[PDB]
Design a protein around this ligand. Structure first.
Ligand SMILES: CC(=O)SCCNC(=O)CCNC(=O)[C@H](O)C(C)(C)COP(=O)(O)OP(=O)(O)OC[C@H]1O[C@@H](n2cnc3c(N)ncnc32)[C@H](O)[C@@H]1OP(=O)(O)O
Ligand SMILES: O=C([O-])CC(=O)C(=O)O
Ligand SMILES: O=C([O-])CC(=O)C(=O)O
Lengths: 1021, 92
């Protein structure tokens, strides 16, 4: 896609990046004035505006300004100011377009004679680049193809300056020959290294001082940005000069760029009654052409798309925008909405119609008020359910909605809505049944579709032999062969895939637009690969021309780029062409037919399969050559291939506007090379070079002898008529219909539309990973951070599933910090240190001590909480608990230090006791426990409440008396084991810190002293 | 029900090739447990079947058993046995 740029941007790029021995004058001498900006700042930032004479021109992509006189030449400052007074900022027109005039380019005027001027133009064609030059200056340059000098330079070819001198400068004046040679060489290099498509400099003032550029136009390959974004800087593409964009049109435009979907909307008549909301660019072209041809040319409101599987929000917004625009002004003859569409490849029709029905139900008021009628036609996955829900809402909201499926032709509904009809060495055999393909990329969906097509076509071997993915190791992917499981090898290099599968002759390159070129070259370096199908869309045209050249030299057939692929029923299917097996079975694409079709875009291919299946025997072969304007295989290269094929009996061709291609078919049939019946119809009339239009092409085909219909509506009718023309003579014999093998429904597909149940295990309630944001209990992660709850808060949410009050969260944090570490001598830290000094990883190392926890190391927390609980809630007063446990011969857990005591407090029990006292509401078990410690510290004085005990009791008392748990919940948590989770968590920090330490100290393997073992082995066993 | 009569497909993960619990008998490689015991292959034989998926010759099975016996223990001072003793001595 070559986009025209503002002449200022081309001027700047020429100034920065030209390279020639001669000197270019007036470098960085230009200015731009808009009605939105004043003059003083521009009059001061460029100090050369008061040095010489100036010339001003409209810099808004306006052609042939010299004949129409929209340029002010040889005028000084106030002269151009007074010239701009009646022009700068209001409605102006040129040719047919009317619109606001926004930009002016101002250039220091160069004194030039009429003989010093020159004409140059470099434009890219399919086979190379044309450079064109005339020496007789001015506008009067005469015919350029005979008197001016042309030069075709090939692709990947270097321009010799001697060739420029010998072939281009034959009639140029001798004085300026040597400077123009270098200038043209530099201009060609500048053209070639910035991927320009069109570069026309007119006129070119070459005086004795040097070279002067005054006016030029440039169209640049917008797809090559990834190569030259650093070179073009901040490139800008101006819209064609015309009327202002409506608020709703700009709304849709900005709503398109936010996603990966294709959303288009352009108004033709804002007060019209026929509105099209159709999926597929070719589909919109077809509906627009049919309505314009069927008398709705003066009433068709707009054209546009919603494609690329738009989201439900995108579809809702697009539908409400398009419906609000038809409810502004009403119409005496009613109003029509046409929700058309091509046959969907894989997108579920039901979901799109759910979005559309939601929008229609929300906008039904004005729609009923304005007396609108909705015609909906669609096909693809689960189109029946979508039509059912559309009819259900048509009966519900009262808006008359007429729903149709694949059985009806595309543009019948627009014939029904308007009331015109009543409303009810290149080879010829690319693919054989022994064909195998290598798929380049992780495209498991496409490969599975190919395998399903192979199985339903009764093939004996899969058509995918191996997959190449450079970003992973060599392994095997598990795929389906009907019911069976098969393993398709995935390789990292192309080389080993090629060697292990020497009989593979097709490569389907699923690479991106910036990786298809080199991959395709590397594939061409293997002689066994006879055809390459390039699916990527957006490869720059120069790289595509290099691909075409190398394919021609190596005899490889390229299908693409920017193609969906080609489908040969019963034999082969490239990637995703045809769609899922619902479309393949609906269009009877599992058995060969006798009609071969060649299309340009991939959106019309599915409709062509539908039409050919429902009107004739069926499709024998169908190839979409791609939407790029340098396709790897033209129409001719495939029509000759079909002519050489004895299997086919008639050929359908569907081209578009632009490109002298079907004239080659005309020359072929008048030459007599093509004899089989050819039906064709070039879509894209849109007449609302003169030979490039679809109407002229259709004519030339009609008088050439090709059965061209008057519109698309009778395309199926004319192919049917050719079908009787060929079966009456007895050359086409309809084959007997054999039922195809059936594949089971996919589980994911059968659950998406919900005809099946599977019970789900792993009930979970602490995190919801899916959706827009992480949800811990019921509050999203953003609300977790905005409410400023810390780690204690997320333990509340994840462990107890409750938004705990602030003091309990801070207490959880506190008891994590006191638990964090207690030295390396203890058993768990010992295990972590031993495993960390044995070369093991953090997980192993720390989890070793993690395991070590539980009973004797680590289990006093719970042991006390569960003891003191059963002591408080059973009535025993503090001193009958001290005495019951003596008698039971057990010790109280939670009571007992070794060195600390009355007078030497524990200092970690004092920080935490003082928070549990100052901040907690009621602490009834910390009181019972601090009374059992009066009875026990009377005995020995070091029998105080240990940190274990305190944390235990204070957590039982925050769980029970805080306000969120209900004393059964708060007693499940104590039993399930949630106090062994606090200890564990705390130790985990310390444990890791003893891994990270013994790893910084680089300590080695620990062999235990043997003097500290005392082997007690038996005598002789 | 829909899979019993086979109108649906679900991809199965967890390819396994060392044991078949389902069916009449346990099958280690392809050789049932009764054949495992009738051919008198020992623990080395079932390492051959489960680990390498092959019915190893008799000397290979006996050598695997031998190298398991020599590896069995090397005292309590070494690091791993130290960790096992520490964790066993903590009541786990
Ligand atoms: C110059 C000279 O020295 S000559 C002086 C001559 N006199 C002496 O020699 C007297 C010196 N000895 C003593 O007085 C001492 O009492 C001793 C050494 C006999 C024993 O004293 P203690 O260490 O207090 O006894 P013990 O170790 O059994 O502990 C006392 C209590 O702590 C309790 N206790 C210990 N740990 C815990 C625990 N974790 N939870 C609850 N209770 C506990 C025990 O149940 C015991 O209870 P009891 O008194 O009801 O049986
Ligand atoms: O088949 C494709 O690649 C295109 C597709 O799914 C869709 O958007 O309908
Ligand atoms: O917490 C435990 O049960 C063990 C411990 O840290 C200590 O040695 O005091």
């Amino acid at each position: 896609s070559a986009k025209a740029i503002s002449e200022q941007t081309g001027k700047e790029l020429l100034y920065k990046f030209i390279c020639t021995t001669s000197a270019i004058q007036n470098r960085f001498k230009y200015a731009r004035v808009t009605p939105d900006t004043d003059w003083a700042r521009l009059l001061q930032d460029h100090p050369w505006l008061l040095s010489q004479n100036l010339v001003v021109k409209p810099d808004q992509l306006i052609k042939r300004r010299g004949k129409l006189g929209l340029v002010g030449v040889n005028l000084t400052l106030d002269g151009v100011k007074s010239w701009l007074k009646p022009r700068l900022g209001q409605e102006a027109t040129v040719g047919k377009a009317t619109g606001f005039l926004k930009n002016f380019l101002i250039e220091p005027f160069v004194p030039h004679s009429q003989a010093e001027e020159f004409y140059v133009c470099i434009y890219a064609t399919r086979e190379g680049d044309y450079v064109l030059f005339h020496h007789e200056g001015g506008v009067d340059v005469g015919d350029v193809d005979a008197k001016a000098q042309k030069l075709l330079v090939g692709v990947d070819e270097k321009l010799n300056p001697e060739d420029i001198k010998k072939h281009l400068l034959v009639h140029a004046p001798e004085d300026k020959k040597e400077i123009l040679a270098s200038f043209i060489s530099g201009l060609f290099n500048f053209y070639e290294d910035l991927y320009f498509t069109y570069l026309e400099i007119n006129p070119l003032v070459v005086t004795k001082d040097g070279v002067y550029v005054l006016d030029l136009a440039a169209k640049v390959d917008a797809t090559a940005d990834y190569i030259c974004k650093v070179k073009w800087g901040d490139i800008e593409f101006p819209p064609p000069f015309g009327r202002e964009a409506y608020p709703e049109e700009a709304y849709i435009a900005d709503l398109d760029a936010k996603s990966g979907a294709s959303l288009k909307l352009t108004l033709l008549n804002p007060k019209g009654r026929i509105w099209t909301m159709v999926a597929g660019g070719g589909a919109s072209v077809v509906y627009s052409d049919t309505i314009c041809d069927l008398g709705g040319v003066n009433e068709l409101a707009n054209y546009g798309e919603y494609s690329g599987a738009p989201s439900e929000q995108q579809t809702y917004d697009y539908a409400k925008t398009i419906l609000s625009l038809m409810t502004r002004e009403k119409h005496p003859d009613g109003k029509i909405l046409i929700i058309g569409g091509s046959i969907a490849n894989f997108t579920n029709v039901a979901a799109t119609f759910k979005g559309i029905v939601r929008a229609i139900r929300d906008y039904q008021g004005p729609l009923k008020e304005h007396e609108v009628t909705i015609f909906v036609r669609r096909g693809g996955p689960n189109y029946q359910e979508g039509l059912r829900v559309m009819g259900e809402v048509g009966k519900t909201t009262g808006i008359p909605i007429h729903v149709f499926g694949t059985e009806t032709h595309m543009t019948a509904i627009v014939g029904m809505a308007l009331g015109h009809r009543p409303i009810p060495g290149k080879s010829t055999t690319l693919f054989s049944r022994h064909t195998k393909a290598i798929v380049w990329g992780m495209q498991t969906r496409a490969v599975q579709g190919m395998l399903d097509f192979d199985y339903v076509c009764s093939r004996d071997e899969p058509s995918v032999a191996a997959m190449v993915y450079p970003f992973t190791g060599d392994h095997k992917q598990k795929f389906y062969w009907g019911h069976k499981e098969i393993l398709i090898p995935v390789f990292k290099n192309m080389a080993d895939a090629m060697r292990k599968h020497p009989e593979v002759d097709v490569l389907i390159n699923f690479a991106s637009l910036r990786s298809a070129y080199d991959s395709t070259m590397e594939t061409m370096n293997y002689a066994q690969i006879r055809t390459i199908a390039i699916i990527a869309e957006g490869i720059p045209e120069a790289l595509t021309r290099k691909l075409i050249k190398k394919a021609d030299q190596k005899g490889v057939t390229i299908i693409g780029p920017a193609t969906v692929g080609g489908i040969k029923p019963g034999c082969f299917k490239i990637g995703n062409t045809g769609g899922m097996l619902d479309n393949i079975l609906a269009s009877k694409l599992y058995r060969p037919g006798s009609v071969a079709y060649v299309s340009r875009s991939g959106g019309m291919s599915n409709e062509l399969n539908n039409i050919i299946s429902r009107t004739t025997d069926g499709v024998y072969e169908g190839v979409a050559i791609g939407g790029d304007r340098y396709p790897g295989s033209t129409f001719m290269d495939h029509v000759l291939r079909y002519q050489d094929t004895p299997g086919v009996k008639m050929i359908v061709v569907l081209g578009e506007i632009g490109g002298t291609e079907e004239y080659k078919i005309c020359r072929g049939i008048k030459e007599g090379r093509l004899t089989k019946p050819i039906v064709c119809w070039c879509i894209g009339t849109c007449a609302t070079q003169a030979s490039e239009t679809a109407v002229a092409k259709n004519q030339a085909l009609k008088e050439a002898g090709v059965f061209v219909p008057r519109s698309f509506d009778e395309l199926g009718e004319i192919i049917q008529s050719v079908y009787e023309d060929l079966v009456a003579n007895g050359v086409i014999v309809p084959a007997q219909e054999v039922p195809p093998p059936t594949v089971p429904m996919d589980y994911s597909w059968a659950r998406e539309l919900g005809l099946i149940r599977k019970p789900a295990s792993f009930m979970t309630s602490i995190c919801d990973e899916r959706g827009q944001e992480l949800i811990y209990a019921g509050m999203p992660i953003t609300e977790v951070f905005k409410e400023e709850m810390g780690i204690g808060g997320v333990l509340g949410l994840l462990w107890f599933q409750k938004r705990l009050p602030k003091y309990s969260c801070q207490f959880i944090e506190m008891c994590l910090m006191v638990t964090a570490d207690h030295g390396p001598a203890v058993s768990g830290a010992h295990n972590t240190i031993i495993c960390a000094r044995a070369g093991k990883d953090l997980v192993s190392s720390l989890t070793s001590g993690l395991l070590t926890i539980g009973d004797r190391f680590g289990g006093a927390l719970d042991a006390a909480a569960k003891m003191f609980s059963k002591a408080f809630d059973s009535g025993i007063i503090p001193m009958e608990f001290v005495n019951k446990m003596k008698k039971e011969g057990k010790l109280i857990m939670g009571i007992g230090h070794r060195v600390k005591s009355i007078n030497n407090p524990d200092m970690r029990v004092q920080i935490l006791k003082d928070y549990v006292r100052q901040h907690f509401p009621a602490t009834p078990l910390l009181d019972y426990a601090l009374e059992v410690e009066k009875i026990t510290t009377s005995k020995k004085p070091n029998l105080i409440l240990n940190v274990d005990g305190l944390i235990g009791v204070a957590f039982v008392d925050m769980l029970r008396n805080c306000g969120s748990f209900t004393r059964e919940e708060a007693d499940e948590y104590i039993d399930i084991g949630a106090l062994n989770g606090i200890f564990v968590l705390g130790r985990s920090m310390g444990f890791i810190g003893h891994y990270l330490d013994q790893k910084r100290l680089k300590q080695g393997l620990y062999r235990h002293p043997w003097d500290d073992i005392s082997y007690v082995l038996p005598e002789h066993m």
